[PDB]
Amino acid sequence: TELFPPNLTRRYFLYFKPLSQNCARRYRKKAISSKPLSVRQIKGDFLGQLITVRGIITRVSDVKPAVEVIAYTCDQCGYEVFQEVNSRTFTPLSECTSEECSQNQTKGQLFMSTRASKFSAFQECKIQELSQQVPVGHIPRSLNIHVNGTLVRSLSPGDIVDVTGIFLPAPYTGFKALKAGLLTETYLEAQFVRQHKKKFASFSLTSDVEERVMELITSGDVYNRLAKSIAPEIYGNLDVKKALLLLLVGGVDKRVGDGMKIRGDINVCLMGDPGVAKSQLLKAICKISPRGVYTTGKGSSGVGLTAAVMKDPVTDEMILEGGALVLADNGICCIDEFDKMDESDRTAIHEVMEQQTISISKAGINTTLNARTSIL
Amino acid sequence: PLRIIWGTNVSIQECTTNFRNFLMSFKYKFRKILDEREEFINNTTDEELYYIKQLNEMRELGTSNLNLDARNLLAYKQTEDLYHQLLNYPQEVISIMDQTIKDCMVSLIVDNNLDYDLDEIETKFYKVRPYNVGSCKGMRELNPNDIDKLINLKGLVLRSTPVIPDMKVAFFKCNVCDHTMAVEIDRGVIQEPARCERIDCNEPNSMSLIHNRCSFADKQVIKLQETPDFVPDGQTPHSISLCVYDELVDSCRAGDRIEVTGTFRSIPIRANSRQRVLKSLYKTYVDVVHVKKVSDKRLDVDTSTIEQELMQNKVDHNEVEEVRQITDQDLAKIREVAAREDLYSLLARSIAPSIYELEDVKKGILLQLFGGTNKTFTKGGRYRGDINILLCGDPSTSKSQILQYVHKITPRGVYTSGKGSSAVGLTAYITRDVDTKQLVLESGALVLSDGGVCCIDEFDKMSDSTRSVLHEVMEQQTISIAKAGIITTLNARSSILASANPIGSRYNPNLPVTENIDLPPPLLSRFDLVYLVLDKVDEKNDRELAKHLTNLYLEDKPDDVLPVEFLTMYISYAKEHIHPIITEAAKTELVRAYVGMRKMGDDSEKRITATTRQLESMIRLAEAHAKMKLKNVVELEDVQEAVRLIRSAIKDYATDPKTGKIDMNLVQTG
Amino acid sequence: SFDRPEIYSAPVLQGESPNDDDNTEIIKSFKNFILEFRLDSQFIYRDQLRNNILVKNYSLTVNMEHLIGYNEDIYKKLSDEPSDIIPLFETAITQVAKRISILSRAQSALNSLPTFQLILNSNANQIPLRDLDSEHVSKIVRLSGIIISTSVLSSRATYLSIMCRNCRHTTSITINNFNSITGNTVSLPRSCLSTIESESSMANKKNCGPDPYIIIHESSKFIDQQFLKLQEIPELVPVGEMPRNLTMTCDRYLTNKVIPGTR
Amino acid sequence: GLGPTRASVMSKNMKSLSRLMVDRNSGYCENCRVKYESLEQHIVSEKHLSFAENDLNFEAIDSLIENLRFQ
Amino acid sequence: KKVDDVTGEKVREAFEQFLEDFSVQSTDTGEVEKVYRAQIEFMKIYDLNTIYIDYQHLSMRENGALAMAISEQYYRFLPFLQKGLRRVVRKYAPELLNTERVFQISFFNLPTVHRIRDIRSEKIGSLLSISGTVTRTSEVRPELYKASFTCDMCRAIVDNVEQSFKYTEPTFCPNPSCENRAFWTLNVTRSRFLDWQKVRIQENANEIPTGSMPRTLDVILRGDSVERAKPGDRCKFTGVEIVVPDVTQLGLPGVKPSSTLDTRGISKTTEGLRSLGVRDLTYKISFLACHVISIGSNIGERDQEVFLNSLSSDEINELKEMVKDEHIYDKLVRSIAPAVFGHEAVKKGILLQMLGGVHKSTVEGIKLRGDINICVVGDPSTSKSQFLKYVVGFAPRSVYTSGKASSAAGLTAAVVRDEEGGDYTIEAGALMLADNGICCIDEFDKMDISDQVAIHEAMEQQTISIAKAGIHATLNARTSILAAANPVGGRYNRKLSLRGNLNMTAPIMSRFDLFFVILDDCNEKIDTELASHIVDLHMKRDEAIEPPFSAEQLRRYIKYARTFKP
Ligand SMILES: Nc1ncnc2c1ncn2[C@@H]1O[C@H](COP(=O)(O)OP(=O)(O)OP(O)(O)=S)[C@@H](O)[C@H]1O
Ligand SMILES: Nc1ncnc2c1ncn2[C@@H]1O[C@H](COP(=O)(O)OP(=O)(O)OP(O)(O)=S)[C@@H](O)[C@H]1O
Ligand SMILES: Nc1ncnc2c1ncn2[C@@H]1O[C@H](COP(=O)(O)OP(=O)(O)OP(O)(O)=S)[C@@H](O)[C@H]1O
Ligand SMILES: [Mg+2]
Ligand SMILES: [Mg+2]
Ligand SMILES: [Mg+2]
Ligand SMILES: [Zn+2]
Ligand SMILES: [Zn+2]
Ligand SMILES: [Zn+2]
Ligand SMILES: [Zn+2]
Ligand SMILES: [Zn+2]
């Protein structure tokens, strides 16, 4: 008999969680999978191994259906013919390869059946090593992360992340004249994702969280305790740190049935003499916040804050990529050196602090984009 | 036993019987019970068989389409399974629905013995359009397991490709004996004949395809800018491609907010033109089943802008509805509201209930929503009753919220910010299509706003080069492009609603009005109303303002004000069926007011001089006031109210005619 | 560095209605003929196949009159077009024989079962060697005579493994037709098959050349083939005319069954 | 067993679905023009009970009843 | 034997009876003249190629079956009509047979005129009438009509091969010397060609929907219809909706139809040593017109003799009556821009601009401009744009442009690329779309400096130079300019000169003959009269407009007066 193979009957996706460093310390095990590497440290000797990379996510593609096996129907014999796909491109089948058609003189014609075929939710992400991992005088490089199955939408741009996956080679992409032998591209088939900063929307009232929360409540004076611990090595500025804590928490977003909205986020300005450690406060606040962005006033231009229209080649479509006010959406945008900015960024932030959107009407796009940033 | 289609859980017999029972035995009171609305059940409409009378009027009118609400399937007990089968397997369940609709059309005259012939009905191909299939989850939150499911989406149309012929029947001709055959398309593939079908002529490769004899069908591709209800953290908006077929072609225009329900599809794309090699990553699109262009939350589209489009809708039998159907009961309700003595204050109060006071501002917004009358000269001229309003004022005067409300209430406006917009981005531009890799035309903000209101926030921050585009829009309601690929006049009959601050970011009484506004004279004169909305510090005004913004926070979900649905349908009816005209009594008032303002402008720039455009603004405002009260003629009191609104907008009573300055404590009443 | 994608099939729908001239239906009818034929009270062909499996004789002997008795349509298809129908009946024998072999050695306590040979005999009218005409070409003929010479056993190739000279591409050619003479109806491919197959994702202009395959003889399989010369009966020959003869080719279990001089 | 009347001609998509089918008291009410799984469930249904309480569709019957009362 | 088309032959019979039977009554006398035999006789003495058939004449036959057959299946029945016309002209005027002469049937007076966006796929291969504005005209090119081939190995010549759209080679090879069909070689000298033009048309500005951009269509003219359409005019094309292969639909979403070879009756053997031909079915709608007529670009030839020959007796009598009037100049001034009150000097200037001066060339070679360029400057809301609206809605060969919506290429000429190919084409700019007309440019002040430079160059030499890409061209742009400008600072400063009030450069200013500074003065009488005029306009529309002359008689007088060279 020819049965449907097991591969066409899985409803589950299987992933590898790396061993924790503490459990390795208990049991005298030394594993290469547990230790976070940088992109520079991931060499050709790690191919095929389950390894963990630490870094920032810079690019996330849209979720697309990548076909793993293609299903065809034959009207001549009634069989379903499945051809596997393990490459970026494939050639479709025309004549039926089932036993009944293979033996028969007349060959049937195969038609694609997209409901009977197997797809994976596919995303390609770019990971870049942190500034603490870049050596002296070097430019950060990038690594490609392949996300398939359930793990999609677990990576977003601007996330410090430990990604554990299988380091696998791919066919060479580049000029044919520059290759020497069997050159291969590289990627990381993602198996596990650990966020350094957990998202506020991802918070769940689990059992283990409750005793820590109740311990902090029973310790008392949580307002003053959380205020003065924001930047413990910055002396004084108790009320400044209190309003920075209120910046981190924020108020209640209000919606009325008429349709108008009142924002709940708080915007805080620190204007002061030089040497009052306000840049240290900005660094501390949007290092504490899970979705914080630090920005120097002339370091970001008008296109570097609102939006830019550019092409994604993996999904092959012309997409809008936001600036710092998009990367800090549902977070805090740290805008250092506020008084030395241009009028373009001032107008963009001027619209952001009230309507929480940016409207772009240019030669490329006519759109509005959500930016619910709290601005420091 | 019972047969099931492979890959599904769908039985043709079971689904046919269930949907037939649903069509024969549905009442809209079931929808009332399902939506937890018991007190709104009425005897005369809910207890009538809904789809029976809808299929009857479908028979009388020659309509071949049934618009089916999927929530109604959940209202009925027996079709609650079928609802899921409509969402999971639209491709065959829709065909089952079409077949049983045809059966029901036969049955309604077979059983009841009507005089209609069966041949015309059974020749017709009835098809169903399901809509309201569920929650509007985003495109980017969908998964490959959602392929070939019914999905509902919000969006704005950016552009549409021309009519594309997709080939349904193929016509092959023999070269030597001129014998022809016609072959049907089968799942996108046409079998070309290797040998001639004739017994006498069997020559190989003698069949050639004649491209003009073979039959085609309409296919159009529309680029839709999606506006999800929920947007994840840092999600930047995208454009989808949606394919409409047959009747639905050219039913969506560029710049309209629509409700697309369709099928989630995925196809592989060829990597090269010469090769048949396909890409493993698939391209997703929506195969559109039904388009809803009407929301009860917002106004209907202006009928004066789509007259030939409505005629083409009638010709093509696309029969997608553009305006709300007004019944008799709600029409009588519209008249009894229109006869109320305080109708003007009632309608102005019902504009923005969350915005406190600004009564004259709301009255002007109401009159801009109504609009003046549109007059088409037989010689060829055209006058458009579009009211332009500038709101200049101190910060935090709820004016940006007024722009947000107007943007939500208008059918096809565009919200823009000062200097976040460019001159090219307001009119038209050349873009690169991702699909065809071709240079395509795409409409700017002002052209996309035709038939609606263009809201421009921070009008003072806009650069003068960008600001120069608006002149032709406010004077002729057109934009005349002479660029590299475009030499044409585009209709932009959009009402400009702008917001601005003074130079010092706060109004200065020591400075005059014109210096405070900081707009050039050929620009400011095009505005029908200029509102100086100032923040005066009072006891009672601050107390009531604080109470108004503070009662909003009493509960999580917060006189007499009309509901937004009734307000929208009232304004839609008044715009569609009421065209007031000027009488001689109104003419005398208009002329006397214009000469009075010109005489007042004689005194010695520092003050806003009277303008011919101010006479035209008075005419348009009086026409909008007459259109409000459902009068077909403009009386004298309409002109007096227009003059009062114009004078109170700029606060002419407060200002000194000589110096041009405005006092605060003396004349102004908060 | 990915693997070759594999293609598999699974029967779901009924498909188009079967036709009698289809190869699958001919194979099924032949299989039912083998399994269901009774001479007096016994399945003679089923028992013969089992006994031949026990003695490692991978062939079946079938009488042609039994095919007349069972189904005339497959009989006339076999008679008119033997080179298309004989491999189908051999495939039917092999499908029955694998089923018999698996159920035999696992109950009466790796194994490769080759394609079975069709030997078919009949008692129909024997046309003489002088009345062979062009109407008998590619037809099954019954004809009598005497045997003059039997040739030595030549070795024909059934299963042969080939390897490319420099490309190192490994391929296998299976042959089930050895009964042709003076010509290679199956030959090694003219060019390397690694390019057209595209089995490797990397796909490492490189051409391997004309006829680049060599036969790995240690992993190839062979059968025996013999040439016989059949003369007409010298008792019935015209006085002034030389007797006429034919060359015959036999293979597999038909070889070494006769000696020269037998009738 | 009256059954419900149906259209003469079937659709091409409907005929295409016949090739895709595999395997996994009752009657028809002409008053409500629906099939029912059981009669006693069709008796307790909003359309049948709403049809029963209405008397304007048995008017001819009513006239006949009146005539047959005074024969 | 070939199979015949019974309905096609009866359409041929009905058409050849129509060509000899149809007749109308004479207007002047009442005689019965058969107009199509007269048309054939007219073609006989001038050796014409095209026969013009009115569609209303064809609709009168039978109950309308023949006209409906021609309308729905024009592509199928066109060769049958051609051979029917061939038979009729053979019976009547055989001299047209010899020169074989190709004939073209042009249909006109179709009952309905379709928009560009109303074109649907159900009308492919059907007779149609559309309208549009011509933007690009290609040059006349030969099209392979009757190809003559020579076989590669038999090497005998064969001629008169049918050519239908895509290039085809015969597979008959009637000589019995060789045995293959596919291999042939074209003889371009011996083969026959027809004229061919691809003119691109755009949706008319009144027909564009509310938010959408105009969409274009490539209509192809053949034979005598070639070069009957000019860049920038409104033409009504009657023809057939055809379909043309398009390759750019590969990336489009949806199932693209494809064609593969059916293999069911082909015997095969697995001898060994599996390729098939599959080809895409992707297309775009095009048009093939047999009749081109140019309706006026207005809402409603230099020699005078040809103009007065065109007019009939009644309108030439009306023109003579207009000429004879002694107060004609005042009536001409009062008839210009009736919606505008006052500003008689601007109306005089507009009239003189629409008339213009003579063009003179000296013996040295320099050209003296006869075109009058007028700039209207003044205070806001002085009806300075109403004049431009009147000139564009009235004057022939007039275009309207805004200052900021302008461009250097859009006003003069553009070098453009189609389908990302190696071919570069020329878009005619606004100055050439108004050639021997008026280019009306509102907000000349808001125009940037580069476009002002590119337009005063075309005011200097009255020509346009192109050197972009591989295209070097000299283009004719002799055009009067009606500019509207606002002063710097908004209002007009009386204390400053005209140069100080305007940012328009000195080369721009030096070539404007008239500078009309129209100003607002506040006095009760004229403000009251102007307000009364405007409210009467709003009340009465066309009833409030009572000019001395209507637009059509004004245009006839202007076109008559432009023939004079004072
Ligand atoms: N209150 C403070 N407590 C501790 N360290 C401080 C304090 N104020 C200043 N410093 C130190 O002085 C330096 C201040 O650096 P910054 O953060 O750049 O201050 P600043 O206010 O941002 O200066 P700018 O850029 O001119 S506004 C750091 O080295 C701080 O550690
Ligand atoms: N009179 C009012 N009625 C209701 N809400 C008000 C009023 N005045 C201020 N607000 C609210 O106060 C906030 C101020 O934002 P906006 O008034 O929208 O800003 P703005 O008036 O446009 O002035 P800008 O942004 O500086 S140009 C909003 O949440 C308003 O809803
Ligand atoms: N003198 C006038 N005679 C007739 N109509 C006038 C006059 N002045 C103004 N109008 C009318 O008032 C309106 C003025 O519109 P426009 O002609 O666009 O103003 P404008 O003269 O172009 O000034 P700018 O430069 O555009 S601000 C139009 O409806 C005119 O018909
Ligand atoms: Mg600092
Ligand atoms: Mg604001
Ligand atoms: Mg103007
Ligand atoms: Zn098959
Ligand atoms: Zn033929
Ligand atoms: Zn090789
Ligand atoms: Zn019932
Ligand atoms: Zn030849």
PDB file of C-alpha atoms in Angstrom, chain D residues 6-60:
ATOM      1  CA  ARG D   6     -35.944  22.447  -7.046  1.00  0.00           C
ATOM      2  CA  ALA D   7     -34.416  24.091 -10.101  1.00  0.00           C
ATOM      3  CA  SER D   8     -34.222  22.203 -13.386  1.00  0.00           C
ATOM      4  CA  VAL D   9     -30.645  23.118 -14.324  1.00  0.00           C
ATOM      5  CA  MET D  10     -27.673  22.562 -12.034  1.00  0.00           C
ATOM      6  CA  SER D  11     -24.417  24.563 -11.987  1.00  0.00           C
ATOM      7  CA  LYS D  12     -21.011  23.607 -13.352  1.00  0.00           C
ATOM      8  CA  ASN D  13     -19.431  24.109  -9.925  1.00  0.00           C
ATOM      9  CA  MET D  14     -22.151  21.877  -8.463  1.00  0.00           C
ATOM     10  CA  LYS D  15     -21.328  19.102 -10.934  1.00  0.00           C
ATOM     11  CA  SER D  16     -17.610  19.596 -10.258  1.00  0.00           C
ATOM     12  CA  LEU D  17     -18.204  18.886  -6.559  1.00  0.00           C
ATOM     13  CA  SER D  18     -19.606  15.400  -7.208  1.00  0.00           C
ATOM     14  CA  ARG D  19     -16.135  14.038  -7.965  1.00  0.00           C
ATOM     15  CA  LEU D  20     -14.765  15.230  -4.604  1.00  0.00           C
ATOM     16  CA  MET D  21     -17.229  13.446  -2.282  1.00  0.00           C
ATOM     17  CA  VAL D  22     -16.267  10.632   0.096  1.00  0.00           C
ATOM     18  CA  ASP D  23     -17.995   8.945   3.012  1.00  0.00           C
ATOM     19  CA  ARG D  24     -17.731  10.108   6.615  1.00  0.00           C
ATOM     20  CA  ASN D  25     -40.384  10.250  11.193  1.00  0.00           C
ATOM     21  CA  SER D  26     -38.706  12.657   8.765  1.00  0.00           C
ATOM     22  CA  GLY D  27     -40.519  14.527   6.034  1.00  0.00           C
ATOM     23  CA  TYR D  28     -41.421  17.816   4.401  1.00  0.00           C
ATOM     24  CA  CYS D  29     -43.914  20.437   5.567  1.00  0.00           C
ATOM     25  CA  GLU D  30     -45.435  22.399   2.693  1.00  0.00           C
ATOM     26  CA  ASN D  31     -47.116  24.895   5.032  1.00  0.00           C
ATOM     27  CA  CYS D  32     -43.673  26.043   6.179  1.00  0.00           C
ATOM     28  CA  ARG D  33     -42.025  24.651   2.993  1.00  0.00           C
ATOM     29  CA  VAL D  34     -39.166  23.128   4.999  1.00  0.00           C
ATOM     30  CA  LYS D  35     -37.800  19.662   5.657  1.00  0.00           C
ATOM     31  CA  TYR D  36     -37.920  18.451   9.251  1.00  0.00           C
ATOM     32  CA  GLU D  37     -35.949  15.777  11.067  1.00  0.00           C
ATOM     33  CA  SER D  38     -38.965  14.887  13.223  1.00  0.00           C
ATOM     34  CA  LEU D  39     -42.590  15.990  13.052  1.00  0.00           C
ATOM     35  CA  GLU D  40     -42.874  16.718  16.787  1.00  0.00           C
ATOM     36  CA  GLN D  41     -39.938  19.139  16.576  1.00  0.00           C
ATOM     37  CA  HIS D  42     -41.548  20.868  13.588  1.00  0.00           C
ATOM     38  CA  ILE D  43     -44.743  21.314  15.628  1.00  0.00           C
ATOM     39  CA  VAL D  44     -42.777  23.238  18.251  1.00  0.00           C
ATOM     40  CA  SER D  45     -41.242  25.858  15.959  1.00  0.00           C
ATOM     41  CA  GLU D  46     -41.843  29.584  15.655  1.00  0.00           C
ATOM     42  CA  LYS D  47     -42.939  29.478  12.013  1.00  0.00           C
ATOM     43  CA  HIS D  48     -45.409  26.604  12.433  1.00  0.00           C
ATOM     44  CA  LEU D  49     -46.930  28.062  15.610  1.00  0.00           C
ATOM     45  CA  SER D  50     -47.107  31.504  13.984  1.00  0.00           C
ATOM     46  CA  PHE D  51     -48.843  29.864  11.022  1.00  0.00           C
ATOM     47  CA  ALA D  52     -51.280  28.110  13.371  1.00  0.00           C
ATOM     48  CA  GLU D  53     -52.379  31.215  15.286  1.00  0.00           C
ATOM     49  CA  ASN D  54     -53.135  33.011  12.011  1.00  0.00           C
ATOM     50  CA  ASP D  55     -56.646  32.404  10.669  1.00  0.00           C
ATOM     51  CA  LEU D  56     -56.516  34.557   7.516  1.00  0.00           C
ATOM     52  CA  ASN D  57     -55.092  31.685   5.456  1.00  0.00           C
ATOM     53  CA  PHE D  58     -57.916  29.223   6.213  1.00  0.00           C
ATOM     54  CA  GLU D  59     -60.583  31.746   5.188  1.00  0.00           C
ATOM     55  CA  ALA D  60     -61.862  29.577   2.337  1.00  0.00           C
TER      56      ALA D  60
END
